[PDB]
UniProtKB/Swiss-Prot annotation:
This is Alpha-conotoxin GIA. Its main location: secreted. It is found in: Secreted. The keyword Secreted applies. GO terms for molecular function: acetylcholine receptor inhibitor activity; ion channel regulator activity; toxin activity. Keywords: Acetylcholine receptor inhibiting toxin, Amidation, Disulfide bond, Ion channel impairing toxin, Neurotoxin, Postsynaptic neurotoxin, Secreted, Toxin. The cysteine framework is I (CC-C-C). Alpha3/5 pattern. InterPro entries: Conotoxin_a-typ_CS. Disulfide bonds join 2-7, 3-13. Transmembrane segments: none annotated. It comes from the Eukaryota. It comes from Conus geographus (Geography cone). Alpha-conotoxins act on postsynaptic membranes, they bind to the nicotinic acetylcholine receptors (nAChR) and thus inhibit them. Belongs to the conotoxin A superfamily.
Length: 13
């Protein structure tokens, strides 16, 4: 649950 570089370092899809 996180598909962008604006998520931080938890950008996992």
């Amino acid at each position: 649950e996180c598909c962008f570089p604006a998520c931080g370092r938890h950008y996992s899809c």
